[PDB]
Amino acid sequence: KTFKQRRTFEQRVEDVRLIREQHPTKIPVIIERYKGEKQLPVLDKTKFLVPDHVNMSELIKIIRRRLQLNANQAFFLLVNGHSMVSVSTPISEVYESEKDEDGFLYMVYASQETF
Ligand SMILES: CNc1cnc2ccccc2n1
Ligand SMILES: [Cl-]
């Protein structure tokens, strides 16, 4: 069901190394809907290559546009399993401190703060 269940640890490590080789300026991001989520739709894919200069505030705007949300729909994003302390941090800095041992950066979205 989840990305980690679909691909082996060895397969996930190797896909991050291929992104380092072929898209060296991109952050490898896994974005998944909270398994309780009723209101928000699913994304068209799971694995995203994010330009390393964008901050978390801009990534939230990108994901709202990808999901085709309207102005009043609530959206909450966890990174590495927890709330973001700040949305102003460049994703290169977020990646270095919150990356998974496989080298992906894991995000989960819900319509409620209570995941
Ligand atoms: C951490 N060790 C490695 C080993 N081989 C690699 C090949 C391509 C890109 C990154 C790589 N990193
Ligand atoms: Cl690149």
Short mmCIF file of N, CA, C and O and ligand atoms in Angstrom, two decimals:
data_model
loop_
_atom_site.label_atom_id
_atom_site.label_comp_id
_atom_site.label_asym_id
_atom_site.label_seq_id
_atom_site.Cartn_x
_atom_site.Cartn_y
_atom_site.Cartn_z
N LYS A 1 0.86 -1.21 0.00
CA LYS A 1 0.00 0.00 0.00
C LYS A 1 0.89 1.25 0.00
O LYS A 1 0.86 1.97 -1.01
N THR A 2 1.66 1.50 1.07
CA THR A 2 2.56 2.68 1.16
C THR A 2 3.79 2.45 0.28
O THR A 2 4.12 1.27 -0.09
N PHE A 3 4.44 3.56 -0.07
CA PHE A 3 5.71 3.56 -0.83
C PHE A 3 6.70 2.59 -0.18
O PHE A 3 7.28 1.76 -0.92
N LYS A 4 6.89 2.66 1.14
CA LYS A 4 7.92 1.82 1.82
C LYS A 4 7.57 0.32 1.72
O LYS A 4 8.51 -0.52 1.69
N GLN A 5 6.28 -0.01 1.67
CA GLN A 5 5.74 -1.39 1.51
C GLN A 5 5.89 -1.90 0.07
O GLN A 5 6.05 -3.10 -0.11
N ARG A 6 5.86 -0.99 -0.92
CA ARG A 6 5.91 -1.29 -2.37
C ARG A 6 7.36 -1.57 -2.82
O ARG A 6 7.54 -2.43 -3.71
N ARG A 7 8.34 -0.84 -2.26
CA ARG A 7 9.77 -0.93 -2.70
C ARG A 7 10.65 -1.36 -1.53
O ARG A 7 10.47 -0.81 -0.44
N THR A 8 11.64 -2.21 -1.78
CA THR A 8 12.60 -2.67 -0.72
C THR A 8 13.48 -1.48 -0.29
O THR A 8 13.63 -0.54 -1.05
N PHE A 9 14.09 -1.54 0.89
CA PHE A 9 15.05 -0.52 1.37
C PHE A 9 16.14 -0.37 0.31
O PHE A 9 16.46 0.79 -0.02
N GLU A 10 16.63 -1.48 -0.26
CA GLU A 10 17.72 -1.47 -1.26
C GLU A 10 17.25 -0.73 -2.52
O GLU A 10 18.03 0.03 -3.11
N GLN A 11 16.01 -0.97 -2.95
CA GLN A 11 15.43 -0.31 -4.15
C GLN A 11 15.28 1.21 -3.91
O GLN A 11 15.53 2.00 -4.86
N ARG A 12 14.88 1.62 -2.70
CA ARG A 12 14.64 3.06 -2.37
C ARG A 12 15.98 3.80 -2.31
O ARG A 12 16.07 4.91 -2.89
N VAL A 13 16.99 3.19 -1.68
CA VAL A 13 18.36 3.77 -1.62
C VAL A 13 18.87 3.98 -3.06
O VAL A 13 19.44 5.06 -3.37
N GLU A 14 18.67 2.98 -3.94
CA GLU A 14 19.21 3.02 -5.32
C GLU A 14 18.46 4.07 -6.14
O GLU A 14 19.12 4.69 -7.02
N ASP A 15 17.16 4.22 -5.95
CA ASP A 15 16.40 5.28 -6.68
C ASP A 15 16.86 6.68 -6.24
O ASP A 15 17.03 7.54 -7.13
N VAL A 16 17.13 6.90 -4.94
CA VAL A 16 17.68 8.20 -4.49
C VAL A 16 19.06 8.44 -5.12
O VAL A 16 19.34 9.59 -5.52
N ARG A 17 19.93 7.44 -5.20
CA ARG A 17 21.27 7.63 -5.80
C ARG A 17 21.16 7.98 -7.30
O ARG A 17 21.97 8.82 -7.77
N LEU A 18 20.22 7.39 -8.04
CA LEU A 18 19.97 7.72 -9.48
C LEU A 18 19.47 9.18 -9.64
O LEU A 18 19.84 9.82 -10.64
N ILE A 19 18.65 9.70 -8.71
CA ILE A 19 18.20 11.13 -8.71
C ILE A 19 19.42 12.02 -8.41
O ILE A 19 19.57 13.02 -9.11
N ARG A 20 20.31 11.62 -7.51
CA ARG A 20 21.55 12.39 -7.20
C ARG A 20 22.39 12.48 -8.48
O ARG A 20 22.93 13.54 -8.75
N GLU A 21 22.45 11.40 -9.25
CA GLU A 21 23.29 11.32 -10.48
C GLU A 21 22.60 12.10 -11.62
O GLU A 21 23.29 12.91 -12.24
N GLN A 22 21.29 11.95 -11.84
CA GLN A 22 20.58 12.47 -13.05
C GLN A 22 19.92 13.83 -12.78
O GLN A 22 19.70 14.57 -13.74
N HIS A 23 19.55 14.13 -11.55
CA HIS A 23 18.88 15.42 -11.22
C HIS A 23 19.53 15.94 -9.96
O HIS A 23 18.87 16.05 -8.95
N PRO A 24 20.82 16.28 -10.04
CA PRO A 24 21.61 16.63 -8.85
C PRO A 24 21.04 17.83 -8.08
O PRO A 24 21.26 17.84 -6.87
N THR A 25 20.28 18.74 -8.70
CA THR A 25 19.75 19.96 -7.99
C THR A 25 18.36 19.71 -7.38
O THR A 25 17.78 20.66 -6.79
N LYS A 26 17.82 18.49 -7.48
CA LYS A 26 16.43 18.17 -7.06
C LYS A 26 16.44 17.45 -5.71
O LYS A 26 17.34 16.62 -5.46
N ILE A 27 15.43 17.71 -4.87
CA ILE A 27 15.21 16.93 -3.63
C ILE A 27 14.22 15.81 -3.95
O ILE A 27 13.15 16.11 -4.47
N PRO A 28 14.55 14.54 -3.64
CA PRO A 28 13.63 13.41 -3.82
C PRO A 28 12.58 13.36 -2.70
O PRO A 28 12.96 13.15 -1.52
N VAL A 29 11.31 13.62 -3.04
CA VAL A 29 10.23 13.73 -2.03
C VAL A 29 9.15 12.67 -2.31
O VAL A 29 8.76 12.51 -3.47
N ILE A 30 8.73 11.97 -1.26
CA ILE A 30 7.57 11.02 -1.29
C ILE A 30 6.41 11.75 -0.64
O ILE A 30 6.58 12.27 0.47
N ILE A 31 5.28 11.89 -1.34
CA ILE A 31 4.11 12.62 -0.77
C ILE A 31 2.92 11.66 -0.81
O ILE A 31 2.61 11.21 -1.90
N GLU A 32 2.31 11.40 0.35
CA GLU A 32 1.25 10.39 0.51
C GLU A 32 0.07 11.02 1.27
O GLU A 32 0.30 11.90 2.09
N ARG A 33 -1.15 10.57 0.98
CA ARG A 33 -2.34 11.01 1.72
C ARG A 33 -2.43 10.20 3.02
O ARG A 33 -2.17 8.97 2.98
N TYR A 34 -2.75 10.86 4.14
CA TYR A 34 -3.00 10.22 5.45
C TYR A 34 -4.03 9.09 5.24
O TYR A 34 -4.98 9.26 4.43
N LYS A 35 -3.83 7.92 5.85
CA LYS A 35 -4.62 6.72 5.47
C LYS A 35 -6.05 6.86 6.03
O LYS A 35 -6.94 6.27 5.43
N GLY A 36 -6.28 7.76 7.00
CA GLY A 36 -7.63 8.12 7.46
C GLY A 36 -8.38 9.11 6.57
O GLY A 36 -9.60 9.31 6.80
N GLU A 37 -7.72 9.73 5.59
CA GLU A 37 -8.22 10.99 4.96
C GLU A 37 -9.48 10.76 4.10
O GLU A 37 -9.46 9.90 3.20
N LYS A 38 -10.53 11.54 4.36
CA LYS A 38 -11.85 11.44 3.70
C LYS A 38 -11.98 12.54 2.64
O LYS A 38 -12.45 12.25 1.54
N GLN A 39 -11.58 13.76 2.97
CA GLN A 39 -11.98 14.97 2.21
C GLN A 39 -11.05 15.16 1.00
O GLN A 39 -11.55 15.30 -0.12
N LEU A 40 -9.73 15.17 1.20
CA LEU A 40 -8.75 15.53 0.15
C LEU A 40 -8.61 14.37 -0.83
O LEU A 40 -8.71 13.21 -0.45
N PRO A 41 -8.35 14.66 -2.13
CA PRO A 41 -8.08 13.62 -3.11
C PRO A 41 -6.69 13.00 -2.97
O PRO A 41 -5.86 13.54 -2.26
N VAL A 42 -6.45 11.92 -3.70
CA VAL A 42 -5.09 11.36 -3.89
C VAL A 42 -4.40 12.15 -5.01
O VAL A 42 -5.07 12.67 -5.93
N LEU A 43 -3.07 12.17 -4.94
CA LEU A 43 -2.20 12.76 -5.98
C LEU A 43 -2.11 11.79 -7.16
O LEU A 43 -2.46 10.62 -6.97
N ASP A 44 -1.64 12.29 -8.30
CA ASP A 44 -1.48 11.53 -9.56
C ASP A 44 -0.23 10.65 -9.49
O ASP A 44 -0.05 9.73 -10.32
N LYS A 45 0.68 10.94 -8.56
CA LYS A 45 1.89 10.10 -8.38
C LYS A 45 2.34 10.28 -6.92
O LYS A 45 1.67 11.00 -6.17
N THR A 46 3.43 9.60 -6.57
CA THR A 46 3.97 9.49 -5.19
C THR A 46 5.32 10.21 -5.07
O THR A 46 5.55 10.89 -4.03
N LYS A 47 6.19 10.01 -6.06
CA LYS A 47 7.59 10.49 -6.06
C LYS A 47 7.72 11.78 -6.87
O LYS A 47 7.39 11.78 -8.07
N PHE A 48 8.24 12.84 -6.22
CA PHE A 48 8.36 14.22 -6.76
C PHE A 48 9.84 14.63 -6.69
O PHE A 48 10.53 14.31 -5.70
N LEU A 49 10.34 15.31 -7.73
CA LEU A 49 11.68 15.93 -7.72
C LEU A 49 11.49 17.43 -7.48
O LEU A 49 11.01 18.11 -8.38
N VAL A 50 11.80 17.93 -6.29
CA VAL A 50 11.52 19.35 -5.93
C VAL A 50 12.81 20.17 -6.08
O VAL A 50 13.81 19.82 -5.50
N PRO A 51 12.81 21.30 -6.82
CA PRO A 51 13.95 22.22 -6.86
C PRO A 51 14.40 22.58 -5.45
O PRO A 51 13.54 23.02 -4.69
N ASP A 52 15.71 22.47 -5.15
CA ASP A 52 16.26 22.52 -3.76
C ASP A 52 16.21 23.94 -3.15
O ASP A 52 16.47 24.06 -1.95
N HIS A 53 15.91 24.96 -3.92
CA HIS A 53 15.84 26.38 -3.46
C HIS A 53 14.42 26.74 -3.00
O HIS A 53 14.29 27.77 -2.30
N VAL A 54 13.39 25.95 -3.31
CA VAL A 54 12.01 26.35 -2.88
C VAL A 54 11.87 26.15 -1.35
O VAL A 54 12.35 25.18 -0.81
N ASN A 55 11.16 27.03 -0.67
CA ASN A 55 10.90 26.85 0.78
C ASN A 55 9.59 26.09 1.00
O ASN A 55 8.85 25.83 0.00
N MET A 56 9.33 25.68 2.25
CA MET A 56 8.19 24.79 2.55
C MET A 56 6.84 25.49 2.24
O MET A 56 5.88 24.79 1.83
N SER A 57 6.76 26.81 2.46
CA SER A 57 5.56 27.62 2.15
C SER A 57 5.22 27.46 0.66
O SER A 57 4.06 27.20 0.33
N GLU A 58 6.23 27.54 -0.22
CA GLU A 58 6.02 27.41 -1.68
C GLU A 58 5.67 25.95 -2.02
O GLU A 58 4.82 25.75 -2.90
N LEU A 59 6.30 24.97 -1.37
CA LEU A 59 5.95 23.55 -1.62
C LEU A 59 4.48 23.31 -1.28
O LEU A 59 3.81 22.60 -2.04
N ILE A 60 3.99 23.89 -0.19
CA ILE A 60 2.55 23.74 0.19
C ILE A 60 1.69 24.30 -0.95
O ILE A 60 0.74 23.60 -1.35
N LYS A 61 2.06 25.48 -1.50
CA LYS A 61 1.31 26.12 -2.63
C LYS A 61 1.32 25.20 -3.85
O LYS A 61 0.23 25.00 -4.47
N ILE A 62 2.47 24.60 -4.18
CA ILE A 62 2.63 23.63 -5.29
C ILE A 62 1.69 22.42 -5.11
O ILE A 62 1.03 22.02 -6.07
N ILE A 63 1.64 21.84 -3.90
CA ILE A 63 0.82 20.63 -3.61
C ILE A 63 -0.67 20.99 -3.63
O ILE A 63 -1.46 20.18 -4.15
N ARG A 64 -1.05 22.17 -3.13
CA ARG A 64 -2.47 22.64 -3.20
C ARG A 64 -2.87 22.73 -4.69
O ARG A 64 -3.98 22.27 -5.03
N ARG A 65 -2.00 23.27 -5.56
CA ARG A 65 -2.30 23.38 -7.01
C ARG A 65 -2.38 22.01 -7.68
O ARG A 65 -3.27 21.83 -8.49
N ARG A 66 -1.47 21.08 -7.32
CA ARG A 66 -1.42 19.72 -7.88
C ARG A 66 -2.72 18.95 -7.54
O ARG A 66 -3.19 18.17 -8.40
N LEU A 67 -3.21 19.12 -6.32
CA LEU A 67 -4.47 18.52 -5.79
C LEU A 67 -5.70 19.29 -6.29
O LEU A 67 -6.82 18.77 -6.08
N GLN A 68 -5.53 20.49 -6.85
CA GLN A 68 -6.63 21.30 -7.44
C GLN A 68 -7.62 21.68 -6.32
O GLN A 68 -8.85 21.63 -6.55
N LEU A 69 -7.10 22.06 -5.16
CA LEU A 69 -7.91 22.51 -4.00
C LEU A 69 -8.53 23.89 -4.26
O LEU A 69 -8.00 24.68 -5.04
N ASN A 70 -9.61 24.20 -3.55
CA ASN A 70 -10.20 25.55 -3.58
C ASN A 70 -9.83 26.26 -2.27
O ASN A 70 -9.27 25.59 -1.34
N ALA A 71 -10.05 27.57 -2.25
CA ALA A 71 -9.53 28.53 -1.25
C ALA A 71 -9.85 28.06 0.18
O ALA A 71 -9.01 28.27 1.06
N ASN A 72 -11.01 27.44 0.41
CA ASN A 72 -11.49 27.20 1.80
C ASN A 72 -11.10 25.80 2.31
O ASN A 72 -11.22 25.62 3.54
N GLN A 73 -10.63 24.87 1.45
CA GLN A 73 -10.20 23.50 1.86
C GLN A 73 -8.93 23.60 2.72
O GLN A 73 -7.94 24.22 2.27
N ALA A 74 -8.96 23.00 3.92
CA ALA A 74 -7.82 22.93 4.85
C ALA A 74 -6.84 21.89 4.32
O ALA A 74 -7.29 20.92 3.72
N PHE A 75 -5.56 22.11 4.58
CA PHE A 75 -4.44 21.24 4.15
C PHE A 75 -3.37 21.29 5.24
O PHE A 75 -2.92 22.42 5.56
N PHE A 76 -2.99 20.13 5.79
CA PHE A 76 -1.88 19.99 6.76
C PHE A 76 -0.86 18.99 6.19
O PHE A 76 -1.23 17.97 5.59
N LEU A 77 0.42 19.33 6.33
CA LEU A 77 1.55 18.53 5.77
C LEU A 77 2.50 18.14 6.91
O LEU A 77 3.01 19.06 7.59
N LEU A 78 2.71 16.85 7.13
CA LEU A 78 3.79 16.37 8.02
C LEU A 78 5.06 16.13 7.20
O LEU A 78 4.98 15.71 6.01
N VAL A 79 6.20 16.33 7.84
CA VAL A 79 7.51 16.01 7.20
C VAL A 79 8.23 15.10 8.20
O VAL A 79 8.29 15.48 9.41
N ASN A 80 8.73 13.97 7.71
CA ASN A 80 9.46 12.96 8.52
C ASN A 80 8.58 12.58 9.73
O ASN A 80 9.14 12.34 10.79
N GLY A 81 7.24 12.58 9.58
CA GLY A 81 6.29 12.12 10.62
C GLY A 81 5.79 13.20 11.58
O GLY A 81 4.97 12.85 12.45
N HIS A 82 6.24 14.46 11.50
CA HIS A 82 5.88 15.53 12.46
C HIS A 82 5.55 16.84 11.74
O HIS A 82 5.91 16.99 10.56
N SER A 83 4.90 17.76 12.46
CA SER A 83 4.60 19.15 12.04
C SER A 83 5.89 19.83 11.58
O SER A 83 6.95 19.48 12.13
N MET A 84 5.79 20.76 10.63
CA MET A 84 6.89 21.69 10.30
C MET A 84 6.97 22.81 11.37
O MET A 84 5.92 23.43 11.70
N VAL A 85 8.15 23.02 11.95
CA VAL A 85 8.41 24.11 12.94
C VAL A 85 8.26 25.44 12.21
O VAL A 85 7.78 26.38 12.84
N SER A 86 8.67 25.48 10.93
CA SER A 86 8.69 26.70 10.06
C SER A 86 8.49 26.33 8.59
O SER A 86 9.02 25.29 8.15
N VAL A 87 7.84 27.21 7.84
CA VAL A 87 7.55 27.10 6.39
C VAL A 87 8.54 27.96 5.58
O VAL A 87 8.49 27.91 4.35
N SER A 88 9.42 28.71 6.24
CA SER A 88 10.37 29.65 5.61
C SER A 88 11.69 28.97 5.23
O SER A 88 12.53 29.58 4.55
N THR A 89 11.93 27.75 5.71
CA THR A 89 13.21 27.04 5.47
C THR A 89 13.30 26.56 4.02
O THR A 89 12.36 25.95 3.52
N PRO A 90 14.43 26.79 3.32
CA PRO A 90 14.70 26.17 2.02
C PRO A 90 14.70 24.64 2.13
O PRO A 90 15.18 24.14 3.15
N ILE A 91 14.10 23.95 1.16
CA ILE A 91 13.92 22.47 1.23
C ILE A 91 15.30 21.78 1.25
O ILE A 91 15.39 20.69 1.80
N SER A 92 16.38 22.37 0.70
CA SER A 92 17.76 21.80 0.82
C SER A 92 18.11 21.62 2.32
O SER A 92 18.69 20.56 2.68
N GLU A 93 17.77 22.61 3.15
CA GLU A 93 18.04 22.62 4.63
C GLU A 93 17.10 21.63 5.32
O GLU A 93 17.57 20.85 6.18
N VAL A 94 15.82 21.64 4.95
CA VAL A 94 14.84 20.66 5.49
C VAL A 94 15.35 19.26 5.20
O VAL A 94 15.39 18.45 6.13
N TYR A 95 15.76 18.99 3.97
CA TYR A 95 16.24 17.64 3.53
C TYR A 95 17.40 17.16 4.43
O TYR A 95 17.39 15.99 4.89
N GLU A 96 18.42 17.99 4.63
CA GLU A 96 19.63 17.58 5.38
C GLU A 96 19.25 17.14 6.80
O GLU A 96 19.89 16.23 7.29
N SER A 97 18.26 17.75 7.42
CA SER A 97 17.93 17.42 8.83
C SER A 97 16.78 16.40 8.94
O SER A 97 16.77 15.68 9.93
N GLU A 98 15.91 16.24 7.93
CA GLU A 98 14.68 15.42 8.07
C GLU A 98 14.64 14.25 7.09
O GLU A 98 13.67 13.50 7.15
N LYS A 99 15.64 14.09 6.25
CA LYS A 99 15.70 12.94 5.32
C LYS A 99 15.59 11.62 6.09
O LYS A 99 16.15 11.50 7.21
N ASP A 100 14.95 10.65 5.46
CA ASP A 100 14.93 9.23 5.90
C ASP A 100 16.30 8.57 5.68
O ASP A 100 17.10 8.98 4.79
N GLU A 101 16.59 7.49 6.40
CA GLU A 101 17.80 6.68 6.15
C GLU A 101 17.87 6.18 4.71
O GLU A 101 19.00 5.93 4.29
N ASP A 102 16.76 6.03 3.98
CA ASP A 102 16.83 5.57 2.55
C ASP A 102 17.27 6.72 1.61
O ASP A 102 17.64 6.42 0.44
N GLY A 103 17.21 7.97 2.09
CA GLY A 103 17.56 9.19 1.32
C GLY A 103 16.36 9.92 0.74
O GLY A 103 16.56 11.02 0.19
N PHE A 104 15.13 9.41 0.88
CA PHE A 104 13.89 10.14 0.49
C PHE A 104 13.53 11.07 1.64
O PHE A 104 13.92 10.79 2.83
N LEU A 105 12.80 12.13 1.31
CA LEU A 105 12.11 13.01 2.29
C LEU A 105 10.61 12.68 2.24
O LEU A 105 9.99 12.87 1.14
N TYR A 106 10.05 12.21 3.35
CA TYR A 106 8.67 11.67 3.47
C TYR A 106 7.72 12.75 3.98
O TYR A 106 8.00 13.42 4.97
N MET A 107 6.62 12.93 3.24
CA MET A 107 5.55 13.88 3.60
C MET A 107 4.19 13.19 3.54
O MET A 107 3.95 12.31 2.67
N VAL A 108 3.30 13.59 4.45
CA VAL A 108 1.90 13.08 4.56
C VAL A 108 0.96 14.28 4.72
O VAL A 108 1.30 15.17 5.50
N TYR A 109 -0.17 14.29 4.01
CA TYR A 109 -1.13 15.40 4.07
C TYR A 109 -2.49 14.88 4.54
O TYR A 109 -2.88 13.74 4.20
N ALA A 110 -3.20 15.76 5.22
CA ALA A 110 -4.56 15.51 5.74
C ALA A 110 -5.31 16.84 5.75
O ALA A 110 -4.64 17.89 5.66
N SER A 111 -6.64 16.80 5.91
CA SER A 111 -7.50 18.01 6.05
C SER A 111 -7.62 18.41 7.52
O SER A 111 -8.16 19.51 7.77
N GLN A 112 -7.16 17.56 8.45
CA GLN A 112 -7.20 17.84 9.91
C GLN A 112 -5.76 17.87 10.45
O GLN A 112 -4.91 17.09 9.93
N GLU A 113 -5.51 18.74 11.44
CA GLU A 113 -4.23 18.85 12.19
C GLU A 113 -4.01 17.56 12.99
O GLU A 113 -2.86 17.10 13.07
N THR A 114 -5.08 17.01 13.56
CA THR A 114 -5.12 15.68 14.22
C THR A 114 -5.02 14.57 13.15
O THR A 114 -6.08 14.16 12.62
N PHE A 115 -3.79 14.13 12.81
CA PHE A 115 -3.52 12.98 11.91
C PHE A 115 -3.85 11.68 12.66
O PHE A 115 -2.99 11.10 13.32
C1 LIG B 1 26.34 6.68 -0.82
N1 LIG B 1 27.07 5.92 -1.82
C2 LIG B 1 26.79 6.01 -3.13
C3 LIG B 1 27.17 4.93 -4.01
N2 LIG B 1 26.95 4.97 -5.30
C4 LIG B 1 26.28 6.08 -5.79
C5 LIG B 1 26.00 6.17 -7.17
C6 LIG B 1 25.35 7.27 -7.66
C7 LIG B 1 24.97 8.32 -6.80
C8 LIG B 1 25.24 8.26 -5.47
C9 LIG B 1 25.91 7.14 -4.94
N3 LIG B 1 26.18 7.09 -3.59
CL CL B 2 19.16 18.85 -11.75
#
